[PDB]
Amino acid sequence: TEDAMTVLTPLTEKDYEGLKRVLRSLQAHKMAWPFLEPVDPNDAPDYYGVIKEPMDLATMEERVQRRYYEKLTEFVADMTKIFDNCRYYNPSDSPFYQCAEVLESFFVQKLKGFKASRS
Numbered sequence: 657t658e659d660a661m662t663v664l665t666p667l668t669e670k671d672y673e674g675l676k677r678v679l680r681s682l683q684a685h686k687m688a689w690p691f692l693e694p695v696d697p698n699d700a701p702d703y704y705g706v707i708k709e710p711m712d713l714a715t716m717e718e719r720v721q722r723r724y725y726e727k728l729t730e731f732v733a734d735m736t737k738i739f740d741n742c743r744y745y746n747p748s749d750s751p752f753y754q755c756a757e758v759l760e761s762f763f764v765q766k767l768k769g770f771k772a773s774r775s
């Protein structure tokens with residue numbers, strides 16, 4: 657199943673080309689700009705004291721380029737931190753919270769396509 661594959665099956669070189677495509681799709685999305693680089697503390701009081709595990713798309717790109725991820729779960733966990741951190745720090749009427757909702761929905765669509773392609 658795709659769930660077990662996601663947790664257990666090591667990422668191959670072919671898998672990594674798919675991860676790069678997924679990442680580039682997210683970076684190009686109209687609602688991705690809040691997530692392209694780390695949050696600046698001057699945009700968000702106490703951000704780094706509140707958020708335990710910050711993440712952003714440039715950090716994920718570096719990690720993809722360095723072959724940091726061994727399993728798809730780990731890549732999904734980093735991506736999900738981006739959206740969960742945003743929704744945790746901000747109120748639901750924040751424009752950043754709204755971007756997280758839209759971009760995660762897009763991620764989920766692309767992720768399902770990638771999982772289907774591994775077979």
Ligand SMILES: Cn1ncc(N[C@H]2CCNC2)c(Cl)c1=O
Nearest residue numbers: 690691693694695699700742752
């Ligand atoms: C509270 N807060 N402040 C900023 C931000 N993104 C920044 C990154 C660079 N340009 C916008 C997010 Cl994602 C957030 O949640």
